[PDB]
Short mmCIF file of C-alpha atoms in Angstrom, two decimals:
data_model
loop_
_atom_site.label_atom_id
_atom_site.label_comp_id
_atom_site.label_asym_id
_atom_site.label_seq_id
_atom_site.Cartn_x
_atom_site.Cartn_y
_atom_site.Cartn_z
CA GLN A 2 33.85 24.02 -29.69
CA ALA A 3 35.93 22.36 -32.48
CA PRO A 4 35.33 20.64 -35.85
CA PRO A 5 36.26 16.92 -36.21
CA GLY A 6 39.64 17.70 -37.93
CA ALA A 7 40.76 19.58 -34.74
CA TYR A 8 40.92 16.13 -32.96
CA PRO A 9 43.73 13.66 -33.84
CA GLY A 10 42.55 10.13 -34.88
CA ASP B 1 48.51 16.58 -43.95
CA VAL B 2 45.82 17.49 -46.56
CA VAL B 3 47.45 19.70 -49.29
CA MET B 4 45.22 22.63 -50.30
CA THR B 5 46.23 24.02 -53.77
CA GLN B 6 44.82 27.37 -54.99
CA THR B 7 44.83 28.80 -58.54
CA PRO B 8 45.44 31.34 -59.75
CA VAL B 9 48.44 32.37 -57.54
CA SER B 10 47.31 35.97 -58.30
CA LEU B 11 44.83 37.91 -60.48
CA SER B 12 44.19 41.57 -61.34
CA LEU B 13 40.47 42.43 -61.92
CA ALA B 14 38.76 45.80 -62.59
CA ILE B 15 36.07 47.13 -60.21
CA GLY B 16 32.65 45.58 -61.09
CA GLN B 17 34.15 42.47 -62.84
CA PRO B 18 33.33 38.97 -61.49
CA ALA B 19 35.98 36.83 -59.63
CA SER B 20 36.38 33.01 -59.39
CA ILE B 21 39.21 31.40 -57.31
CA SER B 22 39.74 27.58 -57.21
CA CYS B 23 40.91 25.45 -54.25
CA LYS B 24 41.79 21.71 -54.65
CA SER B 25 42.25 19.26 -51.70
CA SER B 26 44.56 16.17 -51.85
CA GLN B 27 41.63 14.17 -50.34
CA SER B 28 37.81 14.41 -50.04
CA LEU B 29 36.73 17.02 -47.44
CA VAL B 30 33.33 15.20 -47.04
CA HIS B 31 33.42 13.92 -43.39
CA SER B 32 31.57 10.72 -42.20
CA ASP B 33 29.08 13.09 -40.36
CA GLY B 34 27.95 14.31 -43.87
CA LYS B 35 29.44 17.84 -43.44
CA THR B 36 32.25 19.34 -45.63
CA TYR B 37 34.60 21.45 -43.45
CA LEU B 38 36.05 23.78 -46.14
CA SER B 39 36.35 27.49 -45.19
CA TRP B 40 37.78 30.75 -46.68
CA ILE B 41 39.54 33.71 -44.97
CA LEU B 42 40.87 37.04 -46.39
CA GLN B 43 44.04 38.85 -45.21
CA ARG B 44 44.21 42.49 -46.52
CA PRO B 45 47.46 44.53 -46.48
CA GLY B 46 49.64 44.11 -43.28
CA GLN B 47 46.55 42.95 -41.23
CA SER B 48 45.20 39.81 -39.50
CA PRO B 49 42.85 37.49 -41.44
CA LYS B 50 39.00 37.75 -41.35
CA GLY B 51 36.67 34.71 -41.84
CA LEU B 52 34.43 34.87 -44.99
CA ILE B 53 32.91 31.38 -45.59
CA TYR B 54 32.48 28.03 -43.73
CA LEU B 55 30.81 24.71 -44.67
CA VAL B 56 31.66 25.43 -48.38
CA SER B 57 28.90 28.06 -48.97
CA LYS B 58 27.83 29.64 -45.58
CA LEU B 59 28.70 33.40 -45.33
CA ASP B 60 30.23 34.51 -41.98
CA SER B 61 28.13 37.21 -40.22
CA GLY B 62 28.43 40.66 -41.91
CA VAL B 63 30.17 39.32 -45.09
CA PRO B 64 28.67 40.99 -48.23
CA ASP B 65 26.46 38.66 -50.37
CA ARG B 66 28.68 39.52 -53.43
CA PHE B 67 30.71 36.57 -51.97
CA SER B 68 29.69 32.91 -52.41
CA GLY B 69 31.35 29.47 -52.26
CA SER B 70 30.59 26.24 -54.17
CA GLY B 71 32.16 22.79 -54.51
CA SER B 72 31.90 19.06 -53.87
CA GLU B 73 34.60 16.63 -52.60
CA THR B 74 38.10 17.93 -53.63
CA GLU B 75 37.11 21.00 -55.81
CA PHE B 76 35.86 24.30 -54.31
CA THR B 77 35.43 27.85 -55.67
CA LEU B 78 35.08 31.28 -54.03
CA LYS B 79 33.18 33.76 -56.27
CA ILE B 80 32.74 37.57 -56.12
CA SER B 81 29.76 38.64 -58.34
CA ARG B 82 31.10 42.26 -58.51
CA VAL B 83 34.69 43.13 -57.33
CA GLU B 84 35.01 46.27 -55.10
CA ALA B 85 38.24 48.23 -54.24
CA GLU B 86 38.24 46.85 -50.64
CA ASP B 87 38.16 43.14 -51.78
CA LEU B 88 41.97 43.26 -52.43
CA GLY B 89 44.33 40.94 -50.47
CA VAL B 90 45.16 37.22 -50.11
CA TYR B 91 42.28 34.67 -50.06
CA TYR B 92 43.05 31.32 -48.34
CA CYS B 93 40.86 28.21 -48.36
CA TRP B 94 41.45 25.94 -45.34
CA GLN B 95 40.03 22.57 -44.16
CA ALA B 96 39.08 21.02 -40.76
CA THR B 97 37.70 17.55 -41.84
CA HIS B 98 41.15 15.92 -41.21
CA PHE B 99 43.82 16.44 -38.47
CA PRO B 100 45.74 18.68 -38.66
CA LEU B 101 43.82 21.72 -39.98
CA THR B 102 45.63 23.01 -43.15
CA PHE B 103 45.58 26.30 -45.15
CA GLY B 104 45.82 26.73 -48.93
CA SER B 105 48.76 28.36 -50.77
CA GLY B 106 46.68 31.59 -51.16
CA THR B 107 45.47 33.68 -54.13
CA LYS B 108 46.35 37.44 -54.14
CA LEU B 109 43.61 39.68 -55.70
CA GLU B 110 44.99 43.02 -57.17
CA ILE B 111 42.60 45.75 -58.39
CA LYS B 112 43.17 46.89 -62.02
CA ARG B 113 42.42 50.63 -62.42
CA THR B 114 43.29 53.51 -64.78
CA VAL B 115 46.89 54.70 -65.24
CA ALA B 116 47.75 57.36 -62.57
CA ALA B 117 51.04 59.28 -62.73
CA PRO B 118 52.82 59.91 -59.38
CA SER B 119 52.91 63.23 -57.49
CA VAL B 120 56.66 63.72 -56.77
CA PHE B 121 57.99 65.41 -53.58
CA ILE B 122 61.48 65.84 -52.06
CA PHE B 123 62.59 66.46 -48.42
CA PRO B 124 66.08 67.79 -47.54
CA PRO B 125 67.80 66.41 -44.41
CA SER B 126 66.41 67.79 -41.08
CA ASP B 127 68.75 70.07 -39.05
CA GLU B 128 68.40 67.40 -36.25
CA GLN B 129 70.01 64.69 -38.51
CA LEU B 130 72.69 67.06 -39.94
CA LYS B 131 73.84 67.73 -36.29
CA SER B 132 74.36 63.91 -35.87
CA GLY B 133 76.67 64.12 -38.99
CA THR B 134 74.54 62.16 -41.58
CA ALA B 135 72.30 63.50 -44.45
CA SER B 136 69.18 61.53 -45.67
CA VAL B 137 67.28 63.03 -48.68
CA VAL B 138 63.81 61.52 -49.27
CA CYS B 139 61.95 61.30 -52.62
CA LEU B 140 58.19 60.50 -52.39
CA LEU B 141 56.10 59.20 -55.35
CA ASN B 142 52.43 59.43 -54.19
CA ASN B 143 49.32 57.53 -55.47
CA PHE B 144 50.40 56.04 -58.89
CA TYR B 145 49.30 53.03 -60.99
CA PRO B 146 50.61 50.67 -62.17
CA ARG B 147 53.16 49.66 -59.48
CA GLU B 148 56.33 49.74 -61.69
CA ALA B 149 58.29 53.03 -61.40
CA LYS B 150 61.95 54.12 -61.75
CA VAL B 151 63.71 56.66 -59.43
CA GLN B 152 67.26 57.93 -60.17
CA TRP B 153 69.14 60.22 -57.71
CA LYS B 154 71.27 63.05 -59.22
CA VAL B 155 73.69 65.31 -57.21
CA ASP B 156 74.96 68.33 -59.26
CA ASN B 157 73.72 66.39 -62.39
CA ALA B 158 75.78 63.25 -61.41
CA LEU B 159 73.78 59.93 -61.50
CA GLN B 160 74.19 58.28 -58.03
CA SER B 161 74.72 54.53 -57.44
CA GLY B 162 75.06 52.60 -54.17
CA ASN B 163 73.78 55.21 -51.62
CA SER B 164 69.95 54.76 -51.97
CA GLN B 165 67.16 52.34 -50.90
CA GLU B 166 63.42 52.34 -51.80
CA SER B 167 60.21 50.46 -50.92
CA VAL B 168 56.71 50.40 -52.46
CA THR B 169 53.42 50.21 -50.49
CA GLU B 170 50.89 47.45 -50.82
CA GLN B 171 47.90 48.51 -53.00
CA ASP B 172 45.52 51.14 -51.44
CA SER B 173 42.14 49.60 -50.38
CA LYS B 174 40.31 52.81 -51.52
CA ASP B 175 41.94 54.43 -54.67
CA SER B 176 43.80 51.18 -55.75
CA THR B 177 47.14 53.12 -56.15
CA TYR B 178 50.69 52.50 -54.88
CA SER B 179 53.19 54.92 -53.29
CA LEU B 180 57.01 54.69 -53.18
CA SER B 181 59.68 56.20 -50.88
CA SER B 182 63.40 56.44 -51.86
CA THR B 183 66.14 57.64 -49.39
CA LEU B 184 69.58 58.87 -50.53
CA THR B 185 72.02 58.77 -47.50
CA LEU B 186 75.36 60.67 -47.51
CA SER B 187 77.83 61.65 -44.73
CA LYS B 188 77.23 65.32 -43.66
CA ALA B 189 80.69 66.11 -45.14
CA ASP B 190 79.86 64.51 -48.55
CA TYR B 191 76.41 66.32 -48.43
CA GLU B 192 78.29 69.61 -47.62
CA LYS B 193 80.43 69.26 -50.83
CA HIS B 194 77.51 69.53 -53.37
CA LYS B 195 74.68 71.97 -54.24
CA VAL B 196 71.82 70.39 -56.33
CA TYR B 197 69.88 67.30 -55.05
CA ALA B 198 67.38 65.84 -57.57
CA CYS B 199 65.26 62.69 -57.90
CA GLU B 200 64.23 61.81 -61.49
CA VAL B 201 61.00 59.70 -61.83
CA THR B 202 59.93 57.53 -64.83
CA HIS B 203 56.37 56.04 -64.84
CA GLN B 204 53.85 54.89 -67.50
CA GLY B 205 51.59 57.91 -66.56
CA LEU B 206 54.40 60.39 -67.52
CA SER B 207 55.45 61.20 -71.13
CA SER B 208 58.85 62.51 -69.91
CA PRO B 209 60.76 62.00 -66.62
CA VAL B 210 59.78 64.41 -63.76
CA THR B 211 62.75 65.97 -61.85
CA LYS B 212 62.16 67.19 -58.26
CA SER B 213 65.23 69.11 -56.90
CA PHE B 214 66.51 71.61 -54.30
CA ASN B 215 69.69 73.68 -53.74
CA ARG B 216 71.33 72.82 -50.34
CA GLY B 217 70.78 75.97 -48.19
CA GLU B 218 68.07 77.99 -50.08
CA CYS B 219 64.92 78.62 -47.92
CA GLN C 1 32.36 44.28 -30.44
CA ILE C 2 34.28 40.95 -30.62
CA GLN C 3 38.10 41.46 -30.46
CA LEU C 4 41.24 39.37 -29.75
CA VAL C 5 44.14 41.63 -28.62
CA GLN C 6 47.60 40.00 -28.39
CA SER C 7 50.81 41.19 -26.69
CA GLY C 8 54.34 39.88 -26.06
CA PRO C 9 58.02 40.81 -26.59
CA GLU C 10 59.14 41.20 -30.27
CA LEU C 11 62.90 40.29 -29.77
CA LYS C 12 64.42 37.19 -28.02
CA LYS C 13 67.81 35.37 -28.22
CA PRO C 14 68.12 31.71 -29.33
CA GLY C 15 67.59 29.48 -26.22
CA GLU C 16 65.30 32.08 -24.49
CA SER C 17 61.53 31.66 -23.73
CA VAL C 18 58.64 33.94 -24.86
CA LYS C 19 55.02 34.35 -23.62
CA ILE C 20 52.41 35.69 -26.15
CA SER C 21 49.00 36.76 -24.69
CA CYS C 22 45.62 36.67 -26.53
CA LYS C 23 42.92 38.71 -24.65
CA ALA C 24 39.26 38.10 -25.73
CA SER C 25 36.49 40.74 -25.26
CA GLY C 26 32.89 41.38 -26.51
CA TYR C 27 31.78 37.68 -26.17
CA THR C 28 31.66 34.57 -23.89
CA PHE C 29 35.35 33.46 -23.77
CA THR C 30 34.47 29.85 -22.72
CA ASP C 31 31.95 29.30 -25.62
CA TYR C 32 34.66 29.46 -28.37
CA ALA C 33 37.93 27.60 -29.05
CA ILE C 34 41.19 29.61 -29.45
CA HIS C 35 43.37 28.37 -32.39
CA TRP C 36 47.12 29.21 -32.62
CA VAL C 37 48.54 29.86 -36.13
CA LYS C 38 52.18 30.58 -37.16
CA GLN C 39 52.71 32.93 -40.18
CA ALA C 40 56.29 33.09 -41.56
CA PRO C 41 57.04 36.73 -42.62
CA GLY C 42 56.26 36.45 -46.39
CA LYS C 43 54.57 32.98 -46.35
CA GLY C 44 51.16 31.38 -45.59
CA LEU C 45 49.64 29.89 -42.46
CA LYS C 46 50.49 26.84 -40.34
CA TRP C 47 48.05 25.54 -37.67
CA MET C 48 49.85 24.95 -34.30
CA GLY C 49 46.76 23.48 -32.57
CA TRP C 50 44.00 24.84 -30.33
CA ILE C 51 42.93 25.09 -26.63
CA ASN C 52 39.46 24.17 -25.30
CA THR C 53 38.56 27.39 -23.38
CA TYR C 54 35.98 25.45 -21.22
CA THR C 55 38.16 22.43 -20.10
CA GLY C 56 41.59 24.11 -20.64
CA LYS C 57 42.68 21.01 -22.66
CA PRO C 58 45.27 21.84 -25.40
CA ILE C 59 45.75 19.80 -28.65
CA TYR C 60 49.10 20.20 -30.52
CA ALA C 61 49.87 19.70 -34.23
CA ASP C 62 52.82 17.19 -34.49
CA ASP C 63 55.36 19.90 -35.57
CA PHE C 64 54.49 21.88 -32.33
CA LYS C 65 54.80 19.04 -29.73
CA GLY C 66 57.59 19.67 -27.16
CA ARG C 67 58.55 23.41 -26.96
CA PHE C 68 54.96 24.83 -27.34
CA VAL C 69 52.54 25.14 -24.34
CA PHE C 70 48.98 26.59 -24.73
CA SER C 71 47.43 27.66 -21.33
CA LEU C 72 44.43 29.73 -20.02
CA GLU C 73 43.88 32.61 -17.59
CA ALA C 74 40.07 31.96 -17.72
CA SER C 75 39.09 34.85 -15.34
CA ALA C 76 41.05 37.35 -17.56
CA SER C 77 39.48 35.91 -20.82
CA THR C 78 43.14 35.31 -21.96
CA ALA C 79 44.81 32.43 -23.88
CA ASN C 80 48.64 32.18 -23.51
CA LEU C 81 51.27 30.72 -25.87
CA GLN C 82 54.68 29.82 -24.35
CA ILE C 83 57.52 28.88 -26.78
CA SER C 84 60.72 27.70 -24.99
CA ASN C 85 64.29 27.05 -26.24
CA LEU C 86 63.69 29.52 -29.11
CA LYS C 87 65.32 28.58 -32.50
CA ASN C 88 66.11 30.45 -35.76
CA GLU C 89 62.97 28.87 -37.40
CA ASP C 90 60.56 30.28 -34.69
CA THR C 91 60.93 33.84 -36.14
CA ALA C 92 57.29 34.48 -37.26
CA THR C 93 54.03 36.28 -36.45
CA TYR C 94 51.96 34.20 -33.93
CA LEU C 95 48.17 34.65 -34.42
CA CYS C 96 45.28 33.55 -32.13
CA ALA C 97 41.81 33.04 -33.73
CA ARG C 98 38.28 32.32 -32.38
CA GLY C 99 36.92 28.97 -33.68
CA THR C 100 33.42 27.37 -33.90
CA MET C 101 32.31 23.71 -34.22
CA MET C 102 31.36 24.44 -37.91
CA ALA C 103 35.05 25.46 -38.53
CA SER C 104 34.77 29.26 -38.81
CA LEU C 105 37.93 31.12 -37.79
CA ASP C 106 35.89 34.37 -37.81
CA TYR C 107 37.90 36.85 -35.64
CA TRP C 108 41.76 36.96 -35.47
CA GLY C 109 44.22 38.73 -33.11
CA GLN C 110 46.58 41.34 -34.69
CA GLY C 111 49.46 38.86 -34.04
CA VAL C 112 52.86 39.27 -32.32
CA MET C 113 56.00 39.46 -34.49
CA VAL C 114 58.81 37.51 -32.68
CA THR C 115 62.35 37.92 -34.08
CA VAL C 116 64.89 35.29 -32.75
CA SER C 117 68.33 37.01 -33.00
CA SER C 118 71.65 37.02 -31.08
CA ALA C 119 72.04 40.69 -32.28
CA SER C 120 71.07 43.52 -29.84
CA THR C 121 68.13 45.94 -30.32
CA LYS C 122 68.78 49.49 -31.64
CA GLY C 123 66.15 52.22 -31.09
CA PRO C 124 65.37 54.50 -34.07
CA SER C 125 66.18 58.22 -34.55
CA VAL C 126 62.96 60.08 -35.65
CA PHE C 127 63.58 63.03 -38.04
CA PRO C 128 60.84 65.33 -39.39
CA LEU C 129 60.10 65.48 -43.16
CA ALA C 130 59.09 69.18 -43.07
CA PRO C 131 56.37 70.39 -45.49
CA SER C 132 58.01 72.92 -47.89
CA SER C 133 57.61 74.43 -51.40
CA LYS C 134 59.17 71.09 -52.63
CA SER C 135 56.42 68.88 -51.05
CA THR C 136 53.27 70.80 -52.19
CA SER C 137 50.94 70.27 -55.20
CA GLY C 138 47.38 71.39 -56.08
CA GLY C 139 46.88 72.96 -52.60
CA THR C 140 48.06 69.79 -50.79
CA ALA C 141 51.26 69.44 -48.72
CA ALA C 142 53.16 66.20 -48.00
CA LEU C 143 54.91 65.90 -44.60
CA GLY C 144 56.16 62.94 -42.58
CA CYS C 145 58.68 61.27 -40.29
CA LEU C 146 61.91 59.39 -41.14
CA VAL C 147 62.37 56.52 -38.59
CA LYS C 148 66.10 55.67 -39.12
CA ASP C 149 68.48 52.90 -37.90
CA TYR C 150 66.50 50.37 -35.75
CA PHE C 151 66.41 46.61 -35.12
CA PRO C 152 64.33 44.50 -35.12
CA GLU C 153 61.00 45.11 -36.94
CA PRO C 154 58.42 46.24 -36.25
CA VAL C 155 57.91 49.97 -35.52
CA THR C 156 54.33 51.33 -35.25
CA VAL C 157 53.61 54.88 -36.52
CA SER C 158 50.36 56.79 -35.77
CA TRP C 159 49.58 60.52 -36.50
CA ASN C 160 47.91 62.88 -33.91
CA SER C 161 47.51 59.89 -31.51
CA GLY C 162 45.32 58.04 -34.13
CA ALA C 163 43.08 61.09 -34.94
CA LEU C 164 44.75 61.43 -38.42
CA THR C 165 44.44 58.30 -40.70
CA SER C 166 43.31 59.75 -44.14
CA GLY C 167 46.15 60.10 -46.72
CA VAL C 168 48.73 58.30 -44.47
CA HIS C 169 51.34 56.02 -46.14
CA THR C 170 53.64 54.09 -43.77
CA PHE C 171 56.17 52.40 -46.11
CA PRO C 172 57.65 48.90 -45.68
CA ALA C 173 61.05 49.12 -43.88
CA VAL C 174 64.33 48.79 -45.90
CA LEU C 175 67.37 46.82 -44.56
CA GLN C 176 70.53 49.02 -44.69
CA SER C 177 74.16 47.78 -45.16
CA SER C 178 74.45 47.85 -41.28
CA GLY C 179 71.67 45.23 -40.80
CA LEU C 180 69.55 48.13 -39.40
CA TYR C 181 66.07 49.13 -40.73
CA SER C 182 64.67 52.54 -41.79
CA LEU C 183 61.08 53.52 -42.77
CA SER C 184 59.18 56.62 -43.94
CA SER C 185 55.66 57.64 -42.80
CA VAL C 186 54.01 60.49 -44.80
CA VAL C 187 50.62 62.20 -44.89
CA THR C 188 49.07 64.63 -47.40
CA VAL C 189 47.20 67.57 -45.72
CA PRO C 190 45.67 70.91 -46.81
CA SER C 191 48.48 73.44 -47.49
CA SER C 192 46.03 76.24 -46.29
CA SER C 193 45.80 75.08 -42.58
CA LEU C 194 49.56 74.40 -42.00
CA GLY C 195 49.38 77.52 -39.68
CA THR C 196 46.39 76.23 -37.60
CA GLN C 197 46.69 72.40 -37.52
CA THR C 198 49.27 70.41 -35.49
CA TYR C 199 50.87 67.23 -37.00
CA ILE C 200 52.70 64.87 -34.55
CA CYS C 201 54.06 61.42 -35.59
CA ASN C 202 53.85 58.89 -32.68
CA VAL C 203 56.71 56.33 -33.16
CA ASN C 204 56.78 53.20 -30.91
CA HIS C 205 59.66 50.61 -31.12
CA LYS C 206 58.90 48.17 -28.25
CA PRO C 207 62.24 46.23 -28.23
CA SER C 208 64.34 49.45 -27.51
CA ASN C 209 61.60 51.05 -25.29
CA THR C 210 61.46 53.88 -27.93
CA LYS C 211 58.34 56.15 -27.54
CA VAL C 212 58.80 59.44 -29.57
CA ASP C 213 56.17 62.12 -30.41
CA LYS C 214 57.70 64.40 -33.10
CA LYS C 215 55.94 67.67 -34.08
CA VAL C 216 56.44 68.20 -37.82
CA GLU C 217 56.20 71.93 -38.79
CA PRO C 218 56.97 73.95 -41.97
CA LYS C 219 60.61 74.05 -43.24
CA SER C 220 61.06 77.84 -42.44
CA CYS C 221 64.58 79.49 -42.54
#
């Protein structure tokens, strides 16, 4: 649903 | 946070002229999956944004092909081959390669068009308001260009200060003009004391000031 | 057609809580992320985070951890934003947006303007701006409504229940000495059909429960 930058690292 | 810087802050382009807006990221937007998550949105006057572009150069469904995007790692451009009246508003680049998602500073596109002098109207206070014991007189400057205009209120030839407020519209998405409203507010008693109410308009489209007036109680 | 329609109160006191609703229609709700975006009146856009519409799992930007709760009503195709312990700095428009994996934010809600104030609401007076000999030119007549003395923003103005949109200018509100707002809404119409056509301004100010329909007719004597 979401691009990689939508997830914190 | 990735800082997204956009230049110019604003530009004014004629219909049919090409447009190029730049967007710079404080780090590479090339992700380890090989994709570059740079996107563009447009927000037109008083409304919610619409998506235009994603993955640097992919047009969102229904977006005219006058629009295109290019770029590489930290430099990106949005281009309009041919500007149209409805392209006006604030363009934002934004990125989703790094957490958190961030939006650019925005570029406002104004349409440059021919000089258009205002149509000038005046409205006396309504009987409804007079009954409440206040008197608002409204001066309307309709569909002019450019945006800069001067309104002065005169009551029996006396230049008014301190009893008026005005606002100007955003630019019209169809004729590329502006409109302005000024309100002069007096007590009913102060209103009662004078005869002639006039707004005097100065604009680049006019070679002399235009006075719109009425005489209090003259149907 | 794909639309996000938001609703919520427009005025709250510091310390209070607000719920802002984002209703999706015209597509599969659970196939697309909802993103929450704060827009400061004047300024650009700040990402608050997003909610997975399939799993219900919210992810918060650091500046929005604590007082901000994203939730779902999955069977009503609705995403909810709760802000609690409201502060001066929370005054903003709150936007929802549909998101894809390829990072389109294609469709946006119309937003909800939340003003955080200890001051009380005031509902506007609506006065007609009557068409007259002083508002006509080239066979066209200007007429409108003066929406005076309200707080907070916004007020919505429509004409003939939305049937009249051509030639409408609804001006930005001005802030009077009092800390109250006033705005003008005007329309240009044929001067020839002023006897046959009806012009009503529909003024809505949600915070004061103001719902006025004002018929605007020629000046007269």
